[PDB]
């Protein structure tokens, strides 16, 4: 088998917006947060970008 490493994965910091995080609300979530296909790779179809 070849190496199993994600060549296609957007940068969690530089790809998305630069934001000031409210750590108060961060610890207050205590719940699962959804993830879209746009955050996993850049070879996503236009329709499946928000899924």
């Amino acid at each position: 088998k070849p190496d199993e490493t994600l060549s296609s994965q957007p940068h969690p910091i530089l790809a998305d917006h630069w934001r000031l995080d409210n750590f108060v609300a961060d610890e207050l979530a205590l719940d699962p947060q959804p993830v879209m296909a746009r955050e996993l790779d850049y070879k996503v179809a236009q329709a499946n970008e928000t899924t």
């Binding site: 409210n22 108060v24 609300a25 207050l28």
Partner: protein, 50 residues
């Protein structure tokens, strides 16, 4: 009932003057309660607890 106070200038006046200092420390079975807090204008005006 009426005691004339001869040596003083005024017989009917309250001749003496007193100053008291009573300090009491009373262990009690009283419960009391927790102190309250003051409204914060940063949480409702910015929604910190979103």
């Amino acid at each position: 009932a009426d005691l004339p106070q001869y040596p003083f200038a005024d017989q009917q006046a309250e001749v003496c003057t007193y100053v008291v200092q009573s300090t009491a420390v009373m262990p009690t079975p009283m419960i009391f309660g927790p102190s309250p807090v003051e409204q914060l204008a940063v949480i409702e005006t910015e929604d910190l607890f979103e």
